[PDB]
Homo-oligomer: A and B are copies of this chain.
């Protein structure tokens, strides 16, 4: 049984905080850790959601819908699962379908919803729900989606075949320099590893 002993504020910004965390190990020694925390969430099951969108069309391979967007901390573009903070009072499933439509224009159905999972455990306390969402690419709504992005949001949609995800990801990075998100790569990696 290891414990949080105390949490010291080091600096507060609007969106994110830097804290000094004092905890103690099974030996009984007090140690410290520099933790990052979002000031964004309070009461909820998690900060946000990540959406795994599976574009399903008859007589076709399933596509995985990914987004491409500039990330200021990375100082460059990244390939990611559609994601965003859960609003106040919203279910993970609802935030998932909302975010997906906002960024890609696709309207999907909930397939499954994960427990809250750590985004960056060794550095921060951000948790998310990973929501798998199927998209009927044959239904009339999804024939041609329309993104409804916010002010600061410029999002490009990228669909890659599920049956060949890992190599298509490597292909994109060959054509230009962008960085695949770790959750996306892990997903792609397991697809080839399975069986």
Q: Does A25 contact B (CB under 8 A)?
A: yes
Q: Is the CB of B4 within 8 A of A75?
A: yes
Q: Is the CB of A118 within 8 A of B11?
A: no
A153 CA / B185 CA spacing, docked (Å): 27
Q: Does A125 contact B (CB under 8 A)?
A: yes
A24 CB → nearest B CB, Å: 10
Stretch at the interface among A32-40, A93-101, A102-110, A137-145: A32-40
In the complex, chain B residues whose CB is within 8 Å of the CB of A191: 190, 193-194
- Using known A-B contacts A15-B34, A186-B130, A186-B183, determine if residue A25 contacts B152 with beta carbons closer than 8 Å: yes
A109 CB → nearest B CB, Å: 15
- Using known A-B contacts A73-B21, A120-B123, determine if residue A195 contacts B193 with beta carbons closer than 8 Å: no
Q: Which of B13, B37, B189, B195 meets A73, CB within 8 Å?
A: B37
Counting chain A residues whose Cβ lies within 8 A of the other chain, the interface size class is: 35 or more
A65 CA / B25 CA spacing, docked (Å): 23
In the complex, chain B residues whose CB is within 8 Å of the CB of A118: 71, 74, 78, 179-182
Q: Does A58 contact B (CB under 8 A)?
A: no
Type the 1/0 row for A141-179, where 1 means its CB is closer than 8 Å to any CB of B: 000000000001110000000110000001001100001
In the complex, chain B residues whose CB is within 8 Å of the CB of A125: 73-75
